[PDB]
Amino acid sequence: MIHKLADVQSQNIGDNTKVWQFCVILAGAVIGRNCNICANSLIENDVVIGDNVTIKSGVQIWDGIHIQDDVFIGPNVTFTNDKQPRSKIKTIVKKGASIGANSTILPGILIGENAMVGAGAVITKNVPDNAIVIGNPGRITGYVEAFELKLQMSKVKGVSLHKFHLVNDLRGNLSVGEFEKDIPFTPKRYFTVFGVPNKEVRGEHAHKECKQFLICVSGNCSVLVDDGENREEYVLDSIDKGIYLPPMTWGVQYKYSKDAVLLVFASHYYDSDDYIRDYSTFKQMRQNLEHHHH
Amino acid sequence: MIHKLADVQSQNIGDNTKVWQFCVILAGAVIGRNCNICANSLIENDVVIGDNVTIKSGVQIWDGIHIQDDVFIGPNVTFTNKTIVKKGASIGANSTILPGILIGENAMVGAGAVITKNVPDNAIVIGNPGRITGYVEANFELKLQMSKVKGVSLHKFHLVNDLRGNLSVGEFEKDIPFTPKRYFTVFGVPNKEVRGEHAHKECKQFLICVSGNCSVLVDDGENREEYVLDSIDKGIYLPPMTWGVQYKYSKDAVLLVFASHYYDSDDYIRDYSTFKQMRQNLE
Amino acid sequence: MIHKLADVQSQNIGDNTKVWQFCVILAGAVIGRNCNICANSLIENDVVIGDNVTIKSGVQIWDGIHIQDDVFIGPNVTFTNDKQPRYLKTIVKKGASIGANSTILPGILIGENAMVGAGAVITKNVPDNAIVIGNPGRITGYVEANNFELKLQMSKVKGVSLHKFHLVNDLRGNLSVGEFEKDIPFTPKRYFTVFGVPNKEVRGEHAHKECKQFLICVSGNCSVLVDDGENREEYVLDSIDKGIYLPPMTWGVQYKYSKDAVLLVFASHYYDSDDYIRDYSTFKQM
Amino acid sequence: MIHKLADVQSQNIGDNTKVWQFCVILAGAVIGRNCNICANSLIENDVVIGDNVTIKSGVQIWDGIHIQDDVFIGPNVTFTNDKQPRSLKTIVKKGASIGANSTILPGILIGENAMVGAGAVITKNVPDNAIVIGNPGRITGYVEANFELKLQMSKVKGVSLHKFHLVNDLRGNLSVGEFEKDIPFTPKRYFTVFGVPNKEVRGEHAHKECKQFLICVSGNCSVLVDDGENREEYVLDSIDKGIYLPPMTWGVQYKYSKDAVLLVFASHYYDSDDYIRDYSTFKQMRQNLE
Amino acid sequence: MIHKLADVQSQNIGDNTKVWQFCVILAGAVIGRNCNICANSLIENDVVIGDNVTIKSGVQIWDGIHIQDDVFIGPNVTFTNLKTIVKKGASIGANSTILPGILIGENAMVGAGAVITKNVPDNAIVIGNPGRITGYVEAFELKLQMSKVKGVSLHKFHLVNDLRGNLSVGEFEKDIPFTPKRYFTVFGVPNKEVRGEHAHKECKQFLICVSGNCSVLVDDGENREEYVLDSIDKGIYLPPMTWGVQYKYSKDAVLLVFASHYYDSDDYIRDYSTFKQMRQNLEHH
Amino acid sequence: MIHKLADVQSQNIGDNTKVWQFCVILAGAVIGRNCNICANSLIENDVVIGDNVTIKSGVQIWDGIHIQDDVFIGPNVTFTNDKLKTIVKKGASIGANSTILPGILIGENAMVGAGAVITKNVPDNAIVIGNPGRITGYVEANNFELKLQMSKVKGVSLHKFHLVNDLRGNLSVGEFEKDIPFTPKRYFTVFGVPNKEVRGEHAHKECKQFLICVSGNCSVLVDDGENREEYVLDSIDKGIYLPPMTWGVQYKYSKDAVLLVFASHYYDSDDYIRDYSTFKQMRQN
Ligand SMILES: CC(C)(COP(=O)(O)OP(=O)(O)OC[C@H]1O[C@@H](n2cnc3c(N)ncnc32)[C@H](O)[C@@H]1OP(=O)(O)O)[C@@H](O)C(=O)NCCC(=O)NCCS
Ligand SMILES: CC(C)(COP(=O)(O)OP(=O)(O)OC[C@H]1O[C@@H](n2cnc3c(N)ncnc32)[C@H](O)[C@@H]1OP(=O)(O)O)[C@@H](O)C(=O)NCCC(=O)NCCS
Ligand SMILES: CC(C)(COP(=O)(O)OP(=O)(O)OC[C@H]1O[C@@H](n2cnc3c(N)ncnc32)[C@H](O)[C@@H]1OP(=O)(O)O)[C@@H](O)C(=O)NCCC(=O)NCCS
Ligand SMILES: CC(C)(COP(=O)(O)OP(=O)(O)OC[C@H]1O[C@@H](n2cnc3c(N)ncnc32)[C@H](O)[C@@H]1OP(=O)(O)O)[C@@H](O)C(=O)NCCC(=O)NCCS
Ligand SMILES: CC(C)(COP(=O)(O)OP(=O)(O)OC[C@H]1O[C@@H](n2cnc3c(N)ncnc32)[C@H](O)[C@@H]1OP(=O)(O)O)[C@@H](O)C(=O)NCCC(=O)NCCS
Ligand SMILES: CC(C)(COP(=O)(O)OP(=O)(O)OC[C@H]1O[C@@H](n2cnc3c(N)ncnc32)[C@H](O)[C@@H]1OP(=O)(O)O)[C@@H](O)C(=O)NCCC(=O)NCCS
Ligand SMILES: Cc1cn([C@H]2C[C@H](O)[C@@H](COP(=O)(O)OP(=O)(O)O)O2)c(=O)[nH]c1=O
Ligand SMILES: Cc1c[nH]c(=O)[nH]c1=O
Ligand SMILES: [Mg+2]
Ligand SMILES: [Mg+2]
Ligand SMILES: [Mg+2]
Structure with missing residues (x-):
């Protein structure tokens, strides 16, 4: 389902994936099956989104960003890809990770499986698997289910x-x-x-x-x-x-x-x-080891 | 005034409320009178919004958000998912409101604040995480x-x-x-x-x-x-x-x-x- | 190119400037040559934008914001207009970059070639060449500097x-x-x-x-x-x-x-x- | 009893007071009953010593010093009467004890039943019942507390x-x-x-x-x-x-x-x-009241 | 040699011990050989002093003080009264004050002016008021x-x-x-x-x-x-x-x-x- | 005036010096004019004492100690010899029951406080007190x-x-x-x-x-x-x-x-x- 208020130029969008109003999708993007791409977000060319990804509004997925399966991207999440941007001159979010609202992910960053980036955090470093990261700069403050x-x-x-x-x-x-x-x-x-x-x-x-x-x-x-x-x-x-x-x-x-x-x-x-x-x-x-021992 | 370029599906919008271009407003949403709903914003289904509210651009008001009269929501405010923003409160540009939060009457959320707990009436809250750093007109x-x-x-x-x-x-x-x-x-x-x-x-x-x-x-x-x-x-x-x-x-x-x-x-x-x-x- | 899906009321747009989908530009706006105004962004009436300026998505340039030549304005940057909301002027000086999802308070000057960090909250003027990071933003270094x-x-x-x-x-x-x-x-x-x-x-x-x-x-x-x-x-x-x-x-x-x-x-x-x-x-x- | 090896010039020494060898007592001194003035100690002229006072060896009781009754002055205690001498009265009150080789500054009062610990340098009045130790001496407790x-x-x-x-x-x-x-x-x-x-x-x-x-x-x-x-x-x-x-x-x-x-x-x-x-x-x- | 000007009542004084002027030595006293007991000191009745002891002037060895062999007791050292033992080879610095019932270890060095309120271990150097161990002999x-x-x-x-x-x-x-x-x-x-x-x-x-x-x-x-x-x-x-x-x-x-x-x-x-x-x-094998 | 009850062996005591009782003064000592050496004090052989010195009782001046003119030595002051030459300079004054370690210079007009333990040279005009002695002030200094x-x-x-x-x-x-x-x-x-x-x-x-x-x-x-x-x-x-x-x-x-x-x-x-x-x-x- 690609809403008529959306401007989708890519052909590699899997079945059941919804793109809503005022989304821009460039031609080189690859988005998997069963995703939801909520209103007023944008996805560039050099991008791969896996299956069952939720991308809420006000997000932009720039060139060089890979979003594996089951990832939740909260509203107004912001990515980047240039550490020293100057006018006219790769990040991975691993399976199951969850990125909270109005977070800011610096460039070339790894977010680990099942990690939870907190609303509003500024992620300057790799997030390990399961980690909970909060603040500016984001610090690991807990582990999911601990x-x-x-x-x-x-x-x-x-x-x-x-x-x-x-x-x-x-x-x-x-x-x-x-x-x-x-x-x-x-x-x-x-x-x-x-x-x-x-x-x-x-x-x-x-x-x-x-x-x-x-x-x-x-x-x-x-x-x-x-x-x-x-x-x-x-x-x-x-x-x-x-x-x-x-x-x-x-x-x-x-x-x-x-x-x-x-x-x-x-x-x-x-x-x-x-x-x-x-x-x-x-x-x-x-x-x-558990299967051999029991 | 519902802009040709807005996608407004809800009937329940009161008098002299302007909705501007590229807004999405789902069917359930109820919205009072004299509101200004700026460009590139979203309003989901169970949302009620009072009179004289300003929603600036880049704001997403999800299900379970309630906004009372005279509230100002600045640019790029983010809400999440019951949150209630009480009368006359104003929420600063690009703040982040955590779920289940109450913002008190007349409070002032500073720009960029990450609000993690209830904000009392008249409180000025800033920072990540937000902290009360003062009270209005004190x-x-x-x-x-x-x-x-x-x-x-x-x-x-x-x-x-x-x-x-x-x-x-x-x-x-x-x-x-x-x-x-x-x-x-x-x-x-x-x-x-x-x-x-x-x-x-x-x-x-x-x-x-x-x-x-x-x-x-x-x-x-x-x-x-x-x-x-x-x-x-x-x-x-x-x-x-x-x-x-x-x-x-x-x-x-x-x-x-x-x-x-x-x-x-x-x-x-x-x-x-x-x-x-x-x-x-008493007086 | 003003993209057919933009909504541009301005008549003072310089040549070779591109305005992408779902942007709104009101009649008063002056924008130079060779700018790139990306999707889902807005510009109001009392705005001067110079040449070679990039403005990424989810940005609003409100009344009273002046942006000079060769400025990079990162995704989801937010500017503000009034200090105590319920008429102050911001100027992003030549060559500055403002990092993604930063927030700029009313009335701020951003020095030439400054680098505002991603996510910063900028609550006072930024000098020429400074690098500024944090909430509240603090000078942590200078561009191009036992x-x-x-x-x-x-x-x-x-x-x-x-x-x-x-x-x-x-x-x-x-x-x-x-x-x-x-x-x-x-x-x-x-x-x-x-x-x-x-x-x-x-x-x-x-x-x-x-x-x-x-x-x-x-x-x-x-x-x-x-x-x-x-x-x-x-x-x-x-x-x-x-x-x-x-x-x-x-x-x-x-x-x-x-x-x-x-x-x-x-x-x-x-x-x-x-x-x-x-x-x-x-x-x-x- | 005044030892033959003593040089005692006061006729004012009360009864059953013993003065041991190599003491010097000048003509002006007044001393009460039942005292023991042990060997190698000196007593000057303007001195009143009470009854039952023990003065161990190596002490000098200078002009201006009043020792009241039942006082015990331990060996080698030193008293003074001039605060900045170049070539002022002290009173030791009833029942007080002055530990061995302590040093009492001039013009000082030592209260009844106080205890000056051995070796202490007492620069300030000592209150009744106080225990004082150190250089400079500090009150670090009270007797029977x-x-x-x-x-x-x-x-x-x-x-x-x-x-x-x-x-x-x-x-x-x-x-x-x-x-x-x-x-x-x-x-x-x-x-x-x-x-x-x-x-x-x-x-x-x-x-x-x-x-x-x-x-x-x-x-x-x-x-x-x-x-x-x-x-x-x-x-x-x-x-x-x-x-x-x-x-x-x-x-x-x-x-x-x-x-x-x-x-x-x-x-x-x-x-x-x-x-x-x-x-x-x-x-x-x-x-x-009681 | 018992000087004319001392008042010594003890015959229990070992050979070659010198007792100088203006000393008082009560009769119960025992003093080993070869000692030097300098002018204006005093020794009471239950007192045992071993051999080669030096006692400088202005010192009183009271009842209940035993001093062992080769002790040096400096000038104007002061003892008090319970039993005190000063062990072989210890040396007590000038104008120190020893409280009652104290052990002073062998070859200990008590610093001049120290006020010793606690047992001194063997070899310790002890100074101050109160006396503290600040070092050990030959460390x-x-x-x-x-x-x-x-x-x-x-x-x-x-x-x-x-x-x-x-x-x-x-x-x-x-x-x-x-x-x-x-x-x-x-x-x-x-x-x-x-x-x-x-x-x-x-x-x-x-x-x-x-x-x-x-x-x-x-x-x-x-x-x-x-x-x-x-x-x-x-x-x-x-x-x-x-x-x-x-x-x-x-x-x-x-x-x-x-x-x-x-x-x-x-x-x-x-x-x-x-x-x-x-x-x-153990060194003996 | 040499008191009959003193034991003085030195011939070299200057005019108007008084030596009181139970003092011992050895043959080699030299003492200048107008001194007062109070009772129950001792002075050894290599000692020089200037003019107008007071030595109050209970003091021993050992070999190697020079005391210059106008010095006041308080009661029960103790000197020492062995851890050299002590010099107490002119006008200095040593307070009651102080202790002076060996080999020490006491500067002119210094004031050693009562009970102090002087382990280091004392400069001219210094007031020194405590254990160990510290300079805490100088004489006559919002x-x-x-x-x-x-x-x-x-x-x-x-x-x-x-x-x-x-x-x-x-x-x-x-x-x-x-x-x-x-x-x-x-x-x-x-x-x-x-x-x-x-x-x-x-x-x-x-x-x-x-x-x-x-x-x-x-x-x-x-x-x-x-x-x-x-x-x-x-x-x-x-x-x-x-x-x-x-x-x-x-x-x-x-x-x-x-x-x-x-x-x-x-x-x-x-x-x-x-x-x-x-x-x-x-x-x-
Ligand atoms: C990160 C998160 C899971 C933490 O929740 P929690 O573990 O229950 O934490 P609590 O509410 O008990 O708060 C504990 C502390 O952390 C702070 N805190 C919680 N979330 C924070 C955040 N996002 N940023 C900064 N600090 C935060 C609280 O202020 C408190 O610290 P303090 O006592 O010093 O003020 C959650 O708050 C969050 O950020 N969730 C994501 C919300 C979201 O994006 N939703 C999308 C829905 S549309
Ligand atoms: C919160 C607010 C009212 C406080 O303003 P103020 O009382 O004038 O405070 P000042 O500007 O005097 O600055 C006082 C201190 O707090 C800091 N500060 C102010 N606003 C801050 C904010 N939003 N976040 C973090 N720090 C803030 C200042 O840096 C300064 O602290 P510092 O000295 O340690 O850096 C205001 O700054 C604000 O954020 N307003 C919202 C504006 C807005 O969003 N408008 C939308 C209309 S377009
Ligand atoms: C500000 C910037 C230039 C500094 O990068 P850098 O000098 O290479 O800094 P480092 O990555 O080595 O980080 C150094 C320290 O600063 C912190 N830091 C870096 N950027 C930060 C930011 N934006 N906010 C908070 N902290 C930041 C790091 O966490 C680290 O601190 P710590 O050790 O206490 O955690 C860069 O971080 C930045 O933010 N760039 C702009 C990116 C952007 O917005 N692009 C949009 C266009 S694609
Ligand atoms: C003052 C006195 C009564 C205190 O005895 P006490 O209450 O048993 O004290 P304790 O031995 O329990 O000592 C407790 C603390 O006081 C210190 N102290 C005790 N007497 C001290 C003294 N005279 N000077 C300095 N410190 C002294 C101890 O060293 C210890 O402190 P520390 O733990 O830091 O080392 C006793 O120590 C004393 O000085 N008696 C005088 C005896 C005398 O001179 N007699 C002449 C008769 S022959
Ligand atoms: C105890 C003793 C052996 C330590 O001597 P040392 O190791 O040569 O010590 P130093 O001379 O290097 O002094 C070092 C520190 O200890 C202090 N000190 C030395 N002797 C001290 C004493 N008796 N009491 C307090 N402090 C003493 C010094 O003041 C210095 O400390 P500081 O730097 O804080 O001032 C020695 O100083 C002493 O007291 N000797 C006894 C002399 C005596 O009585 N002789 C009788 C013979 S007639
Ligand atoms: C050294 C001396 C000259 C200082 O006199 P002063 O400046 O009037 O000193 P103060 O009495 O005003 O006392 C000031 C401080 O020094 C301390 N103090 C004074 N004399 C001290 C001494 N001899 N030892 C240790 N501390 C001493 C006081 O306790 C007070 O300190 P505190 O407030 O921490 O207790 C004098 O106290 C002294 O010792 N005089 C020698 C007396 C003597 O021996 N005379 C022999 C002739 S009879
Ligand atoms: C003052 C000064 C000292 N020095 C060195 C040499 C001096 O001996 C030493 C200062 O030591 P010193 O004068 O002995 O110490 P104090 O003055 O505290 O008694 O440092 C210099 O090289 N240049 C200088 O300008
Ligand atoms: C999630 C979603 C639902 N319905 C809409 O119209 N838009 C959206 O973005
Ligand atoms: Mg934002
Ligand atoms: Mg004495
Ligand atoms: Mg003494």
């Missing part, structure tokens, strides 16, 4: 939460933990992360083999743990709190305070090969 | 000092500095015009927070910021003024039926309040329009 | 020198020293100190006809733009042994001051309000 | 400690107290004390009629309460803890922190003749 | 440095500084010579506190101050040295049988300790002289 | 209210500079040969000085100087060989001119303090006069 006793279990597979023995007196303070009793392994390595800008997002990975144990020894940080299907986020803000990450648990650490030091104990020596850094690969290697 | 040199707002007075207290320390003193029924029955203290208030937003029916109140600073809006239903309480020798008297707000607390601010009455949750008035009526009713 | 590693080093900005002073450190506390004529190349008649500057503030924005300056950041840090008309560069003054020499006729800006920063300036001449060139065009011509 | 419940009596007569209703959340914090219900009177006055240096001792008085209620609204300070027989010290360290001082309670507020702001409710208008500033006087008064 | 650039102190190692860990923050890394059995069974952390220590003051019979320890700073004394019984731990990339290894002290903590300081064994109260040695002897012992 | 004011100290002036404060910041400014009465050839800056440091302690033969504390606080002593005063420089708009031949000291620096100094001549080592007695003599020409 203590006071010795050992509690998370909702995420095998992730356990710990409280360590803490003593307070006049001479000072002490907390202690035992490997194999408290923390469920014996490390071969520890490292520390500190001096981390409050905007930064650390981790975004999983380990095939290495077990990890995390303790924020001053200030605070937030830790996201993800098992491929469940996801949960914890504030670590005292030296006597700790989180166990089994191997094949995807982890993020972010929202570090200015004073924050993260101490990590690790079951194995350092190994660049032991990292999975793509969430979709992770999600798939985890099912393989 | 010192302490002397012992006593009367405010333009009915019955509100300002006090500078006796202050002694020396080598041993500092002291300030005030006396009840003398520098402060009543004998209190309660005191309370508010502190650790986040800077983004807005406190109070009520009036008292019977309770007199006296306000001193004993460290840090906070700002105090007092409002008598017609006049409103905003004051900075930034030293312990400064105080503000609120007579009963004075609407008060306090906000922009610094991180270490402690507000001390003395009150004529013991706590009584039924003594509050939390709706500004209600409070407005009750004042017009 | 060291203090040697004692003396010349900038590309004409006459401008960068200096590293003798520094003594021991357990009794630290000393740095500088000598007039010798290390700093004039004898001062005045010194002044700039301090307690908010972090959003831009200072200077001028050049001097006769007055020579030597800047030293004596606690904390600030940034110094020096501009000779052609070239410009930004330096960070973050240490008491680092100094910069500004000859006369050097446009200067100090901004990005830290909370505790104190700038110390040595001058060759007594204070003289007549010696200031505030006007960036006026400056470039000379 | 938990805010859990809403209401709680003190050892000190009539003194109450109060825990006030607190509310903590995301919006901020609030505490509230009501007069004649939480605080046992209705104020006519309030005053605030702030910017007190950490060495200052404030108060040191009792009121004849004024009730007072103390809340430390920011930071911390310490409050000594004294009823003439019992005394206790409390730490005021949060806005929700207060302390009631009935009339005729001796009060001191000291050890203020930098940020400390003390708030006081008062039952009466400011009145300078309501003060009692002498501890002995106050004590007799708080005995003559 | 990080490479990946690994060996201490003078037997078996002690200093470690510099891999450090990465960049845009996104900072990272320091350690590996057990490569950087740190053991695998731990326990970590502990110590924080919010007042700047005046002295921590540790023990050796372990078996437990290995590795110390990294993770923020702020503290100082760490290591002592193998003959040799000792103090080091400053002021960044997360510096580490110190303590083999078993190393006497350790952690002090001068900053308000911010967090010490992280890795230990080879589980927590065993019976693995502590808290008496330095016991520790020193046990150590001379 | 400023900056007016644009310009003159000090009792010769030719010293106090400046308040033009100060602008508004929304955009603050700015303070001063012009050479107008507010500041000379034209600079050099500037230098002093910072990160520990609060216990005393800096300067010299005069210049030729160099004029001008001081502004552009951040923090700083105290400055100025001294013209006869009058002296101390000023606090605690905002960027206060300034102090030191004409040539002005002894100046700066001390009591706060942690953030930065001292800016304008000098009329280029740096020249030889223009310093670092001895105060030498400055006072030069100053009477």
